From a paper:
We also solved the structures of two variants (S10T and [name] variants in complex with GSH) which did not show significant differences from the wild-type. The [name] substitution also did not fully abolish the activity of the enzyme even though it decreased significantly (divided by a factor close to 250 as compared to WT). R11 formed a salt bridge with the N-terminal carboxylate group of GSH in the crystal structure (see above in Section 3.3). The electrostatic influence of R11 on the catalytic process was, however, clear since the catalytic rate was 75 times lower in [name] compared to WT. This was accompanied by a significant one-unit increase in optimal pH suggesting a higher GSH-thiol pKa in the [name] variant than in the WT enzyme. The SynGSTC1 residues with the largest contributions were R11, K51, R116, which formed salt bridges with the GSH negative charges. The arginine residue was invariant, the first position was replaced in a few cases by a threonine residue and the last two positions were a bit more variable.
Numbering used by the authors:
A (entry chain B), B (entry chain A): 1 to 183
The structure:
């Protein structure tokens, strides 16, 4: 089965949420970051950059939480997808991991970036229940996790963005979220 | 042909570098950031977050430099046709856009992050000419671009990482790099 390498307060929890949404079994392998287990040869053979999360699926190893989400989304796909459909999912995973995370969590750019990012998402989320439309997808796990860590880590809220706040509340109340990030 | 929306000193030159490597024509469209053209309705209809680069491939619109690089690579038939082969390229594009760019360019984490990132890249680049092995790929455009911007922006060099220095020097001399980022 999928082996997921993680640690507390890492993006491994985001992979755990998507694994809960897909109802896929997996092995959780804790990597002791406090004792530098991630900086030693066995873990460096899984991720040469010494970061969690990572997965092993047989002899296949994969790191970067975003690429793990896209990989799990592809393996669980029923209807074959083309380059454009994968590109729109990849666009949002890249966005969650760079533009969105940086704009919310980098103190020097937050005052400028964060209101703009939330204002743009407010328009999207005010027209559809989820990022890609009516149906929840891996994009909501990627963008939603970054947004949910805003109250958790920044002590900030989404009161000025009612549609963003309702979307984040809805994500937080999903049993798959409560069994993973919410635990 | 692809319409590429860019600006000087943006990641549009990275997309242009890859289009030149693929020998693909493109229509470059400048978005005047200094005059706020990226925050106007026509550009917001291409990228609702008002960032460059973005592409239009007929009626298909796509933003995030990383997703554009992955889409162009898929379209050009340079990645094998399976979820594992795509996940490995995705891993490197996400790494370039998040882990690598943050560790090199964010001052509060550079002291701890940069030597570890460069030491791991040095080991990889000491064993093969390019990140995936013998052949140049979109991974070299994504990772190599970030590395080439280290002297260009931070005034740092790779004197202590010989394989990284030689790799960057080789990338900067490629005709497609000179026709785009080097121009
Ligand atoms: N872009 C990466 C970031 C990974 C990352 O920053 N992981 C941290 C935990 S939050 C880590 O393993 N840090 C250990 C270290 O840098 O020594 C991802 O999304 O997977
Ligand atoms: N993660 C994005 C970053 C894009 C980005 O930050 N673009 C800048 C130019 S370097 C921009 O358009 N900034 C305009 C603004 O922030 O208003 C990507 O790689 O596409």
């Amino acid at each position: 089965m999928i082996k997921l390498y993680g640690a507390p307060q890492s993006a491994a929890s985001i992979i755990q949420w998507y694994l809960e949404e897909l109802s896929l079994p997996y092995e959780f392998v804790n990597v002791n970051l406090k004792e530098g287990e991630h900086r030693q040869a066995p873990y460096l053979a899984i991720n040469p950059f010494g970061k969690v999360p990572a997965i092993a699926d047989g002899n296949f190893h994969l790191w970067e939480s975003g690429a793990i989400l896209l990989y799990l989304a592809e393996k669980a796909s029923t209807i074959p997808a083309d380059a454009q459909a994968r590109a729109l999912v990849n666009q949002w995973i890249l966005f969650a991991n760079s533009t969105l995370a940086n704009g919310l969590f980098i103190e020097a750019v937050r005052e400028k970036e964060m209101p703009r990012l939330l204002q743009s998402l407010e328009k999207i989320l005010g027209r559809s229940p989820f990022i890609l439309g009516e149906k929840f997808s891996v994009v909501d796990v990627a963008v939603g996790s970054i947004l949910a860590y805003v109250p958790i880590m920044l002590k900030l809220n989404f009161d000025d963005y009612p549609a963003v706040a309702a979307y984040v509340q809805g994500l937080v109340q999903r049993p798959a979220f409560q069994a993973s990030i919410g635990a």
